[PDB]
From TrEMBL, chains A, B:
Keywords: Disulfide bond, Secreted, Signal, Transport. Belongs to the PBP/GOBP family. One of its GO terms (cellular component) is extracellular region. It comes from Anopheles gambiae. It comes from the Eukaryota. Residues 22-165 form the OBP47-like domain. Disulfide bonds join 5-169, 18-159, 19-148, 33-59, 55-129, 102-139. It is found in: Secreted. Gene3D superfamilies: 1.10.238.270. PANTHER family: IP02236P, ODORANT-BINDING PROTEIN 59A-RELATED. The keyword Signal applies. InterPro entries: OBP47-like_dom, Odorant-binding_protein. This is Odorant binding protein-8. The keyword Secreted applies.
Amino acid sequence: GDNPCAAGPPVDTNPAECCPKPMLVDGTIMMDCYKKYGEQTKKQLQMDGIPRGCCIAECAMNATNMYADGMLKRDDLSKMFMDAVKDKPEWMSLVRDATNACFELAEKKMDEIEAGAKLEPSFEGEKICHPISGTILRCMGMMMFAQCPASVFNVNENCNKLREYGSICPMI
Amino acid sequence: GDNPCAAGPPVDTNPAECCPKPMLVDGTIMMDCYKKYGEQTKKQLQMDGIPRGCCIAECAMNATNMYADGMLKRDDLSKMFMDAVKDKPEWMSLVRDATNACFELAEKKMDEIEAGAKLEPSFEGEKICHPISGTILRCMGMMMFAQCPASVFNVNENCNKLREYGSICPMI
Ligand code: NA
Ligand code: NA
Ligand code: NA
Ligand code: NA
Ligand code: NA
Ligand code: NA
Ligand code: NA
């Protein structure tokens, strides 16, 4: 109420339930990649210093042929994202804009990202992945959740509260 | 492990506790604006159609002489943001980049925002605000949480489960 951001998010409320976000990357490929590199990404989240590249995302862009030679193929990736919403026009504008927004966001921190790409293993068998893939993929999901079209949002007291929280609390 | 997102976010954990996100606008102003316009923004979030402008934000930008005539003053506002973290060097690059990203997002969504500024009251005392201020202030707080620097993140089990959620779940 008064301080609504105090309580925090609604409990049994999964944002993927509330907002049926289209699959920009094949879901089977993404879960495969998660099963393989999920534990490493979880560890790296707790490491200090330059953020380390997400190997889940880099796995996903390898498998879809969008990452190669330290380079993520912007035009090819953008087109894959549009193809994923070819049956969802309510998302087409949004997916287009998020794409450019996310690529431009990466460009602003490109120095940090490239630094991240150049790290050496901190330990035994550390896979050093280029952070570009995970920057784009996390950016997209966030851009999309945060701007979920009203026409697709799932309406219920907890999804409505999750929406109220995420829309108001970040600014106050 | 197996289903890292179905479970959803940690139960009683408030992002602001795990992440000491700096206040870019004076909290008094934000709270006064929220008390005036909270309820109306809550109803607007449930309305279909073009997204309606957030009056909480517009109120705050009025209070600080940042909004006038369908336009936020980009230079003055950016300056105000940077000034707000002058003693938080671990947020400077982040806030400045977020500032540019967020204005440039607004630019991409310009027709929608302008259309939202012209909407008609759907209920009796509904105030129609320009969406530009809400666009910027939500964008900023969302960019800032989503990239909370490792060096300032409060570490415990729940804040780590939260960060794992926030970084992995939006991409799968
Ligand atoms: Na780190
Ligand atoms: Na665009
Ligand atoms: Na941009
Ligand atoms: Na390393
Ligand atoms: Na404007
Ligand atoms: Na720019
Ligand atoms: Na009007």
